[PDB]
Amino acid sequence: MIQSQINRNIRLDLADAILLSKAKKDLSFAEIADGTGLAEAFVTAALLGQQALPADAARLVGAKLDLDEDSILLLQMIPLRGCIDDRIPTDPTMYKFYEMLQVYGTTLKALVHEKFGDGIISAINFKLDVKKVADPEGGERAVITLDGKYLPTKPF
Amino acid sequence: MIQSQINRNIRLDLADAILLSKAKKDLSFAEIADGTGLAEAFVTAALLGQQALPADAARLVGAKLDLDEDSILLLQMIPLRGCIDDRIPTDPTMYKFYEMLQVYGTTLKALVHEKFGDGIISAINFKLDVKKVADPEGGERAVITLDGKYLPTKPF
Amino acid sequence: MIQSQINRNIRLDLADAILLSKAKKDLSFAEIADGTGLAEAFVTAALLGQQALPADAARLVGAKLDLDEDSILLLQMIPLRGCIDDRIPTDPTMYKFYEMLQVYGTTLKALVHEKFGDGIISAINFKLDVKKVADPEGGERAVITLDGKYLPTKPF
Amino acid sequence: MIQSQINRNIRLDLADAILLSKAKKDLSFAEIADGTGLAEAFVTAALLGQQALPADAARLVGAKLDLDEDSILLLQMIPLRGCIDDRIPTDPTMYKFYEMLQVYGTTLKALVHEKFGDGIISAINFKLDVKKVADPEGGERAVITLDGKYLPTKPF
Amino acid sequence: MIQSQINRNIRLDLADAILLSKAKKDLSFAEIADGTGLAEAFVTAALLGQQALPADAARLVGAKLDLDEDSILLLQMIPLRGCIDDRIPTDPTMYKFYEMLQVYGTTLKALVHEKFGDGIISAINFKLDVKKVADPEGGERAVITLDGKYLPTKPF
Amino acid sequence: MIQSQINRNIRLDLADAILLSKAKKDLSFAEIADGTGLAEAFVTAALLGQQALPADAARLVGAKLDLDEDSILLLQMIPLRGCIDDRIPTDPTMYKFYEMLQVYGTTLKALVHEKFGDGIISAINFKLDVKKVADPEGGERAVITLDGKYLPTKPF
Amino acid sequence: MIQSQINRNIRLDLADAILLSKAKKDLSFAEIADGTGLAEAFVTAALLGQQALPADAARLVGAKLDLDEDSILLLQMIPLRGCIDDRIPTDPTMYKFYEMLQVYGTTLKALVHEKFGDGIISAINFKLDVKKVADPEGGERAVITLDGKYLPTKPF
Amino acid sequence: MIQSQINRNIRLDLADAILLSKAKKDLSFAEIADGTGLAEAFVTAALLGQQALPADAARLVGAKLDLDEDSILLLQMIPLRGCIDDRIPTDPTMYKFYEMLQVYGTTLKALVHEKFGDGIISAINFKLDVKKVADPEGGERAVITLDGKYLPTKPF
Amino acid sequence: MIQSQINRNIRLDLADAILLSKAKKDLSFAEIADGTGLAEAFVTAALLGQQALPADAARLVGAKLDLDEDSILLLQMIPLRGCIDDRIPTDPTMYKFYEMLQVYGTTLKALVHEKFGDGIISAINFKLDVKKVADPEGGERAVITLDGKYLPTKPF
Amino acid sequence: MIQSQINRNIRLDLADAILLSKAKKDLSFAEIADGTGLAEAFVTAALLGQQALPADAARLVGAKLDLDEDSILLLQMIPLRGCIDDRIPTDPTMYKFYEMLQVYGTTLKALVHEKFGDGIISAINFKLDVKKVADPEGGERAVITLDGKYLPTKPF
Ligand SMILES: [Cl-]
Ligand SMILES: [Cl-]
Ligand SMILES: [Cl-]
Ligand SMILES: [Cl-]
Ligand SMILES: [Cl-]
Ligand SMILES: [Cl-]
Ligand SMILES: [Cl-]
Ligand SMILES: [Cl-]
Ligand SMILES: [Cl-]
Ligand SMILES: [Cl-]
Ligand SMILES: [Cl-]
């Protein structure tokens, strides 16, 4: 039977223990998500308390990280989602995504309505991925792809 | 000589004036960006107060929207950027982007450090586009691509 | 061409003007929505800056309330949604709905997960209605029906 | 003799103990509420620290979840209600109920005053239920019914 | 037909107009409420935008303050209630009532539960009055009486 | 010699222990303050961390609740007062009192200045009591009396 | 009859007009307060919207600053007090008094409870002055005296 | 070698242990500071985590309160200063000093600039004392003196 | 006589006026500060409402920007300082100085105490300059130098 | 393989442990960073949880401070950065750098755009140093140099 959480700190504590294990084993997130059938981002978001793993993926990543039974079971719980400590990120890496919203949120609204119509892009019916790409000027670029279903507001 | 703003309300007031004129003339953002050299997202951001237009583009959009000279000039100022009224958006369209951060923010961090290293994805060396694609299962998907340069932290 | 807002105050200023005109003419919301083809909840929300009316409905309610042409046009814009002044309602009537969330919000989470799965009830593919019902123990009850599409989260 | 709580953290910690014991036993909220004489939504709220169970119900559920006597006693205490961590939910499932308020809160005010009068719909003399039903267009909808007593403001 | 507001500022602006008028006429609130059939605190609350006046009362107080027709009309509207600018009062006279809550809030909960049970003291079915008495050790005391209906929460 | 706290959490954890003790022994707040020479509301506030008990009261309540000697001593310190977790109450019982302030707070200011003059009603030279009184329309009413010294501002 | 305000902006806008007049005329606060029978801290605070001037004083300053009669009448009304824009000063001169509270706030408490007892030092029955006095080590110090009554807290 | 803190809770936890010890032994702050050569306000602020003791003072107060060597050493650390839990005090005693700033804050600024000039009054080159002075009209007055160097701003 | 401000919006509104004027005349801050005797950073801060100009400088920049006499006089007032609209900057250029404090805040504390001792670095006895230095690796750096006086805290 | 953190408290707790060890051994930060290859500001930031140490440096400082292996590993993780407890610093030493931003933030934007163009100064590609210079007038000045790469904004 589906089980769900109501206090994010139970899964966030476990996130921290997972990350300590990961480090001691010198693991990558790519290699933890290998063999689960599930994208890097999805599996990583789960370890970090933001998705549920199916029973088999839970058992497999739990094997790779030496997790007790209670942990493997926590990973299959539907989480109380929300990874930002207090609304606005302090961490520069995370912050720059928030800054993208402070610069473009209204343009994104404006252009979503023009191209699709009244309503929203889903973050539920949704995938993302992060791709490292060569910058043609030297260095590297991240291509983060947000792929969500257009959901129209339709009048009643 | 480059000129800059310190109070966002001046450009955000102009943005409202622009949208009314835009509505009266029944224009699209695609049409307004036509003949500027500049991507739709970049030109939309500027009208909405989040980017400067070069003089030529400013005159060009300004003639389309029948803007006065002060307005054409304001559009060339470097803005006091920040489009969200009060940190967290109320508007469902804008809010879903914020929610993507609440679900994936720590995943984006984790994976950025794994793939690139210690540093950040730029919001300044950056590009975004919004693309509509049909959904195999019916409907339209929005694919929003955030494209930023990786900037490493290096020890000193 | 679809036109969208970015500053809630334009439509909220217009809502206040509409509400004064309404009261001068001694109209109900029922009678303003009558003839539009649209549900009284929808037309009301539109008046109050939270939905867009189609042009014909905008002209009808325009004529009823004696609104000018720019006002009828504003009523057709896709709003910057968000009716609460500062996140938490101060008004007792509005506040009690919030209070229902403070009491039942985790129970709603738990029961959505058990009855539907991992995901959300949509507020976009959505309708609500308010019905007066006699209370067998004297007086009147409000039955408020919130009706939204289940959107699952599925792993990727 | 009636007993009451002043710090939510005591029943919320108990909430988390309950959900782990629930998860370990692979129980459902429906089967914990069975035999209590009480709605599923009522008993769940109580598990999650938002209502008091009567001693008979507290004893029945405590023996389902193997809880100690101090816990069975806590469940009968009148709680310090408020399930939301910091005012605005971060969890998308919970958040969408809040989003319903951001969009329709003033419509609900307007329509309660129109249909009932000056006053409020009670969150106390109140019930709720959640039903799953097929959507004629395909998929499933949730029907959440909020059923409260109208309490008039009467002048003095 | 009943009419209601959704932005407190329209009625708060009218409050400031009422009070300038009152000052110029050197009127008290006792005198404005006289002949109204309504308690001083009720009529005052209404002038200050926190209650609605019946039509006769509104015309009567408007006669005494020389208010235009729209104003007399605004006083009959159901207000968007909430007199505190930004949640916590800055003004020392108002702040003390807030302080009484910081000191006695939890005692009031405890003693409401013990004396009545699980539920709330109504703020809607409610009367308020302020009485000046002599202090036995010299000076004056304020005896403020909050008189609200007990509404139990009962299981469902 | 007089002893005082600077962090509310010491006394509030103590309150949680007191309430647990109290619940086991199935005591009321009536019976705990009995024998104390002090008003029910004063003694309850003290147990809840919002008042100091004198040593004899501290001893008498400590024997009834079976508290250790360090606790009986803590009960005697002058508290770091402030019972609301985070400024606004989430609990519907405590919240109605905050709502009374949102509706009537400016009316209280206004009427205080009219009856007494420029200054404040004391919450330190203060008492409160709660009484049940049957409502002749049916059920029960809570009559809460707030009784505070008037303290004028006088120019200097 | 005493008149009072409920919106601070009305008196704060007047403070701004007073200050520009005061500058045009190159006046000091000492000169404005002279011949008034009142301390410069008191009179200045009134001009700044935080105290009420008695009628005589009000007419005296109003003459100095060339104020209209509505402004002289406003200076006699009882203000909605609170001079800090948003809880915490941004101004370095003002902020430093706030920093004195962050460093020494708990000490002040501890030492008021030691020297006087349970209770508070008044900000209402209160005098304030500011002296420039040379520093024996060189330069100038500021000596600011907060002279307030001790208001005890005792059982009931 | 000078040592400093970055997390206030280490010294604030110690502060609570000091106060429990102080109470158990029934000491006063005047007697803890006596023999130290240091002003009572200074020594008290250090005990409460807002100043650092020199090593001999740290040893001397540690003897009187029976503290361990880890504690005595902590007392000598330069603290992370900030005694107010969350910006605005909840405690009536501490709050009144905050209210003094809400009333007199702009006046203190206006009178600093008049009497000294453009700059600030120091909270660092600063002392404060608290004297009891009986009132001509009866009871006692607290005369708190804030004595800080004046630091001008001057153009560069 | 020294004249000071107490509402930042008067000088910030002027700041905007100055900025439009500046842009119309296509002037740099470098050139406006020329001839005033004052550092470009000082003169710019003044224009932006964060410093006062001496009469002569105010009349010079006044001539340059075509300001009227009330303005030239506002430029000479001691401002109510604080340039950030709502505590945390939204603008990427201003935000990165805030991020400097989030990353290095505690390091600056720790190193200040190690190198100078207990106390602060002044932001009043202070100056800053911004200098463009070529980066060896390609492009440009800004070297921003903050030059403040060490003000010790020492006991009393 | 690179390891990163998502919860600042793990490393902020280690920072507290480091500082106590550091206190006990009476070390300075200059000594701890000696032999590290790395600047003092860089290494201190790392101990305080705001930078990652390369393995050799981690091993060195761990030896000096007697840190266990889990700790030496932690210091190599990429941190969840953000040293400020709750956005605005309470500590006077930290606070003055925040005030520099409230006074000069917009001046820094302005001069950055004039001297470099549209864009930001990096806090990532960044060096920071703190130096003591004798004050020609008497005492010591702190010169903090912030040295960051300029990152331009250009249209796409
Ligand atoms: Cl969604
Ligand atoms: Cl960037
Ligand atoms: Cl949705
Ligand atoms: Cl209710
Ligand atoms: Cl249900
Ligand atoms: Cl109610
Ligand atoms: Cl008081
Ligand atoms: Cl008081
Ligand atoms: Cl200082
Ligand atoms: Cl300073
Ligand atoms: Cl950067």
Domain edge (last residue) among J62, J88, J114: J88
d(CA C126, CA E128): 41
Distance CA B5, CA I22 (A): 11
Cα nearest neighbour of I97 on chain A: A92
Scored b (16 or more CB within 10 A) or e, G11-46 reads: bbebbbebbbebbeeebbbeebbeebebebbbbbbb
Neighbour tally for B131: CB within 10 Å: 11
Q: Enumerate the β-bridge partners of residue I132.
A: I142
Residue where the block lists tokens 């008498």? F60
Residue H54 one-letter amino acid: P
CA-nearest residue of chain F to E147? F143
State the nearest Cα–Cα gap between C55 and chain E, in angstroms: 24
Closest CA to I110 of D97, A115, E133, J48: J48
Residues with Cβ within 8 Å of D144's Cβ and at least 6 positions away in sequence, in order, are C108, C121, C145, C146, C147, C148, D128, D129, D130
Tokens at residue E134, please?
A: 């002599």
Neighbours of chain B (3+ CB pairs under 8 A): A, C, D, I, J
Pick the residue of B19, B47, B94 with the most C CBs within 10 A to test the interface with C by mutation. B19
Kindly determine whether residue B109 and residue J52, on different chains, have CB atoms separated by under 8 Å.
no
Q: Closest residue of I to H107, CA-based?
A: I6
d(CA F146, CA G1): 26
Could you say which of G39, G68, G88 is where a domain stops?
Answer: G88
Q: Compute the CA torsion angle D147, D149, D155, E3 (nearest 10 deg).
A: 30
In angstroms, the CA F149 to CA I31 distance is 63
Does H10 sit within 8 Å of J26, measured CB to CB? no
Resolution to one decimal, Å: 2.1
Contact E84 C90 (CB under 8 A): yes
I143, I107 Cβ separation under 8 angstroms: no
Name the domain count of chain F.
Answer: 2
Strand order through the sheet with B140-152: A119-134, A140-152, B140-152, B119-134
- Sign of CA pseudo-dihedral A101, A102, A108, A113: positive
CA-based nearest residue to A145, from A52, A40, A61 = A40
For tokens 């030529």, the residue is B56
**Do C83 and C10 belong to one domain?**
yes
- HEC string of chain A equals CCCECCCHHHHHHHHHHHHHHHHHCCCCHHHHHCCCCCCHHHHHHHHCCCCCCCHHHHHHHHHHHCCCHHHHHHHCCECCCCCCCCCCCCCHHHHHHHHHHHHHHHHHHHHHHHHCCCEEEEEEEEEEEEEEEECCCCCEEEEEEEEEEEEECCCC
Q: Tokens 């209204």 sit at which residue?
A: A106
b/e string for I117-149 if b means 16 or more Cβ within 10 A? ebbbbbbbbbbbebeeeeeeeeebbbebebbbb
Contact (CB, 8 A) for C108 and C34: no
| Chain E nearest C-alpha distance from C90 (Å) | 5
Q: Which residue of I has its CA nearest to H111?
A: I4
CB contact under 8 A, H90 and F77: no
- Looking at the fold, whether D100 and D155 belong to one and the same domain comes out as yes
Token pair listed for F52: 């100091």
CB G66 within 8 A of CB G27: no
Q: In this structure, are G28 and G79 located in the same domain?
A: yes
Radius of gyration in angstroms for the set of CA atoms belonging to chain I, rounded to a whole number: 18
Q: How many CA atoms lie within 13 A of B52 on its CB side?
A: 20
In chain F, residues with a C-beta closer than 8 Å to the C-beta of E154 are none
Written as six digits, the tokens of B8 are 């966002």
- CA geometry: angle H26, H30, H32, nearest 5 deg: 65
Closest to D107 in 3D by CA, of C59, C93, C139: C93
Q: Say whether both F46 and F64 belong to one domain.
A: yes
Residue A98 C-alpha from the chain's centroid: 15
DSSP state of G25: T
- DSSP per residue, chain E: ---B-S-HHHHHHHHHHHHHHHHHHT--HHHHHTTSSS-HHHHHHHHTTSSPPPHHHHHHHHHHHT--HHHHHHHHSBP-----TTSS--SHHHHHHHHHHHHHHHHHHHHHHHHT-SEEEEEEEEEEEEEEEE-TTSSEEEEEEEEEEEEE----
Residue F30 in 3-state DSSP? helix
Any chains having at least 3 CB pairs less than 8 A from chain I are A, B, G, H, J
Report d(CA C110, CA A4) in Å as an integer.
6
Residue F132 sits in a domain whose CATH number is 3.30.1160.10
- Which one-letter amino acid corresponds to residue I148? G
Burial of D63 (0-12, 13-18, 19+ CB in 10 A): exposed
Task: Name the packing angle between helices E8-25 and E69-76 (round to 10°).
Answer: 120
Among I109, I123, I133, beta carbon nearest to J100:
I123
Task: Give the number of other CB atoms < 10 A from CB of residue A48.
Answer: 27
Contact by Cβ (8 Å): B104, A45: yes
Q: By CB neighbour count within 10 A (0-12 exposed, 13-18 middle, 19+ buried), where does F25 fall?
A: middle
The strand order across the sheet containing F119-134 reads E119-134, E140-152, F140-152, F119-134
Residue G28 C-alpha from the chain's centroid? 16
Report the residue from F90, F99, F103 with minimal CB separation from C102.
F90
Residue from G2, G4, G5, G6 to probe the interface with E (highest E Cβ count within 10 Å): G6
* Residues D30/D40, Cβ–Cβ less than 8 Å: yes
Which domain CATH number covers D78?
A: 1.10.260.40
As a whole number of angstroms, the distance between CA D27 and CA D19 comes to: 9
- D23/A3 touch (CB, cutoff 8 Å), yes or no: yes
Distance of CA G33 to the CA centre of its chain: 13
Instruction: Name which of F109, H26, F52 is nearest G119 in CA terms.
Output: F52
CA distance J124 to A93: 10
Of all ligands present, the nearest one to the C-alpha of B123 is 2
Residue I95: closest C-alpha in chain A: A99
Q: Which residues on chain E are in Cβ contact (under 8 Å) with F141?
A: 147-150
Q: Which residues of D109-141 are buried (b: 16+ CB within 10 A; e: fewer)?
A: bbbbbbbbebbbbbbbbbbbebeeeeeeeeebb
I-chain residues near H151 (CB < 8 A): 122, 124-125, 151
Cα(B80)–Cα(B5) distance, integer angstroms: 5
| Pairing verdict, β C119-134 and C140-152 | antiparallel
What distance in angstroms lies between residue C146's CA and the mean position of ligand 6's atoms? 22
| Interchain CB distance below 8 Å, B90 and C73 | no
Which region holds residue B37: left if phi is over 0, alpha if psi is between -120 and 50, else beta?
A: left
Distance CA(F13)–CA(D72), nearest Å, equals 21
The token pair that represents C99 in the structure block: 């209070």
Nearest to B129 by CA among A112, D39, C129, F94: A112
Rounded Cα distance between I67 and I69, Å, is 7
Residues in chain F: 156
> Is chain B in touch with chain F: ≥3 Cβ pairs within 8 A?
no
- Chain D environment of C100 (Cβ under 8 Å): 123, 126, 128, 146
Ligand 9 centroid from CA G90, angstroms: 15
Report chain D's terminal Cα–Cα distance, integer Å. Answer: 36
Q: How far is the CA of C85 from the CAs of B90, E80, G8, G70, in angstroms?
A: 10, 11, 19, 32
Closest Cα in chain F, distance from residue D125 (Å): 12
Let me know how long chain B is.
Answer: 156
| Crossing angle between the packed helical segments B92-115 and A40-47, to the nearest 10 degrees | 90
C-alpha–C-alpha distance, residues B111 and B99, integer Å: 18
Chains C and D are in contact, defined as 3 or more C-beta pairs closer than 8 angstroms: yes
Exposure string for J49-64, b = 16+ CB within 10 A, e = fewer: bbbbbeeebbbbbbeb
> Do G75 and G147 share a domain, yes or no?
no
Distance between H136 CA and the closest CA of chain J, angstroms? 39
Phi, psi of C128 (to 5 degrees): -135, 160
Nearest-angstrom CA–CA distance, G57 and G46? 10
Based on the fold, state whether residues H59 and H102 are members of the same structural domain: no
Are residues I74 and I142 both part of a single domain? no
Rounded to an integer, what distance in angstroms lies between the CA atom of residue A106 and that of residue B84? Answer: 8
Q: Which residues pair with J16 in a beta bridge?
A: none
Q: Which domain holds residue F79?
A: 1-88
Examine the fold and report which residue of D30, D63, D88 is the final residue of a domain before the chain moves on.
D88
User: D100 CA to chain B: closest CA distance, Å?
Assistant: 10
Q: Which residue out of J2, J7, J125 would a mutagenesis test of the A interface target, given it has the greatest number of A Cβ atoms within 10 Å?
A: J7
Dihedral sign computed on CA atoms, order F94, F97, F102, F103: positive
Looking at the structure, tell me whether residues A53 and A95 fall in a common domain. Answer: no
Closest Cα of chain G to J70: distance in Å? 36
Per DSSP, F54 falls in state P
**C10–B22 C-beta distance less than 8 A:** no
Say which residue the tokens 């205080």 belong to: F112
The Cα-based distances of A15 to A20, A43, A88, B117 in angstroms read 9, 12, 20, 20
The C-alpha atoms of residue B94 and residue C81 are separated, in whole angstroms, by 10
G65 and G114 together in one domain: no
Chain B residues whose CB is inside 8 A of the J124 CB are 119-120, 151-153
Q: By CA distance, what is G148's nearest residue in F?
A: F153
Task: With CA atoms as reference, report the closest residue to D28 among D14, D43, D13.
Answer: D43
Secondary structure class of C67 (helix, strand, coil):
coil
Question: Is residue E121 domain-shared with residue E143, that is, in the same domain?
Answer: yes
CB-side neighbour CA atoms (13 Å) of I62: 18
Residue J73 CA: distances (Å) to CA of C39, D66, E80, J4, J52: 62, 40, 57, 11, 10
Same domain, D52 and D113: no
Q: Are residues A101 and A52 in the same domain?
A: no
Cα gap F28→D12, rounded to integer Å = 24
Note residues around ion ligand 1 (Cβ under 5 angstroms). A 122, 124
| Measured CA distances, B72 to B47, B63, B67, B77, F120 (Å) | 10, 9, 6, 10, 54
d(CA J138, nearest CA chain A) in Å: 39
